[PDB]
Amino acid sequence: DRFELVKYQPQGDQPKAIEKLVKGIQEGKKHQTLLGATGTGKTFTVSNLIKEVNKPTLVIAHNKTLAGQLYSEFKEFFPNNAVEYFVSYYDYYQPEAYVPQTDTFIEKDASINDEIDKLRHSATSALFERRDVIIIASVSCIYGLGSPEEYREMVVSLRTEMEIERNELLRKLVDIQYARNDIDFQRGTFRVRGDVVEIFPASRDEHCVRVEFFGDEIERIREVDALTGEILGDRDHVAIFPASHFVTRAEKMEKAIQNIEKELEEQLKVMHENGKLLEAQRLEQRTRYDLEMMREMGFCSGIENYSRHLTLRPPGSTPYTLLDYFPDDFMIVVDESHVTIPQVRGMFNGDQARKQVLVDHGFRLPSALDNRPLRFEEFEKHMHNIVYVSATPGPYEIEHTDEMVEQIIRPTGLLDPLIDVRPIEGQIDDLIGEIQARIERNERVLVTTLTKKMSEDLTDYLKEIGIKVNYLHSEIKTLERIEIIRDLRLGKYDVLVGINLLREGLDIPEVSLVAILDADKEGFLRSERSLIQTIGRAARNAEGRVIMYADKITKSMEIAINETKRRREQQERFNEEHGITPKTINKKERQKVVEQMEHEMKEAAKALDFERAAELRDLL
Amino acid sequence: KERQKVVEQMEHEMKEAAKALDFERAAELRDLLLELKA
DNA sequence: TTTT
């Protein structure tokens, strides 16, 4: 079950980085940190690590876009091993919560995205079928999922020449959440024509399994294209896995409704005892309806709130998560650990706050808190070997690593950027001329401001002057941010102005200067981490530069600038010694009418009506 | 997988030309994609 | 930006 890594070849200090990481695992180190400067080919080093050490491995990312971005990259890297994608199947999700300040109730609202649910089944099922598995996951991997042991157990195993009656197979299929559907054959479904059962495994939406009977004997098991009926391959064994990650059998369920009534009675005593009358009226009203529905249907909305009860498991119990579907001997790679670790930690506490106000006000039983992500202590318990990837490791990462593993040599020898510090007086003006110059070399600019105020003004200033610019409002969704970045790349804007440039996908090779206003102001935005990552955006260009405007040099500035300067020096040492040349890898009435024609254009692109999209483009 | 890999790749590239506003190229791809489905 |  080896990993088969598939166009590059370790360049720069990649070999050395890989060497240390692997050795580090071999030495059985629990925490290592790959201190990779931006643009150094971090995901490729990780890839090499994975191949040499040969464990199933979990890759955690802070946002879904990056996650998707790595997934793509790893499917290309290991075309022959199971790369999987474990994220939230919610395409929209407005949680249930209560606001006491206004006595109003947010109903849970949610649309499940079929493609993702499939990719999550693809993921958990893969961990049971083979060892050559990479999963790219969000913090979804610390949220809850049925017992891996109950799931591994509820697998229907078919093999040719097996004895088994067709209808018996059907029973088993229903007990694990499959749905007989003859007219609309989709994943999660099976269909029957005489001696042929066709199951559409929940983890596929393209291929299915055809089980041809003769009496009570499986004759052959085929893989077929579901739409067509075209045969892809015979199998002598097939594992069909549950079509859902949390199935309660009727027997478990009866006892649960019991336990929920007992909990409920206990809780009512305590509220009535404390004169929380309104809250008990509601707790009981709600819990009782939920219960009726569970006797009638073995289903109610918000059923997940009762999850711990459906496991028959004792209070305070750690959820089962993806972490649990892995072998004991597994590896975790934490991309952007400075952001991702905080995020992994903040999940339990953000979750428990929301539910406690719901429970205090009687919308949910206390047992509802047992439906939670993991505490970080619990996460920690699944740490066999863990590699942290960051140009700016966080405190957790530093504290637990013995020696960093640095990776600073970019593939095309692209250098860390030159930094100018200049004073706060003349700021806007000095900057203005640095932008004009840049517009003249068909190059782009990022400027970071501390505030909404300064960002807004300077943007209006730029526009007033006939410069093309966009203000990245913190309220901008990444989907939108990407339209804007692209536009910057293409030249529809020449400058971007914002507060946080460390927002996703801001790494663009056409950017030749990064201006940092109010650099000496420390805080979050001018910490060593921020400064560095911000400096980071100027290193995708053979000419990259950074101007920090500041009246003094702060501890943050010092460490930031110093590190940039050490790196650039080694990257030049190397470049020289290796003969490499740094190459770049690569008006109110009109405002409203353009916004509406851009929508109608984006719309026609999606419909693939590319001729209409172009009429609209040439309009704009 | 090999035929669908090509299709999935033509697909990506076609969304990509749309996003560059290279709609000309996007149509060309579209029309090509249609023929292979057929 | 992320989750139920």
Ligand SMILES: Nc1ncnc2c1ncn2[C@@H]1O[C@H](COP(=O)(O)OP(=O)(O)O)[C@@H](O)[C@H]1O
């Ligand atoms: N060994 C290599 N040889 C050639 N090119 C590489 C190599 N490793 C990475 N690259 C490419 O060069 C660029 C820099 O890598 P990137 O993934 O941006 O690194 P990071 O994850 O540190 O930002 C990427 O587009 C990457 O695909």
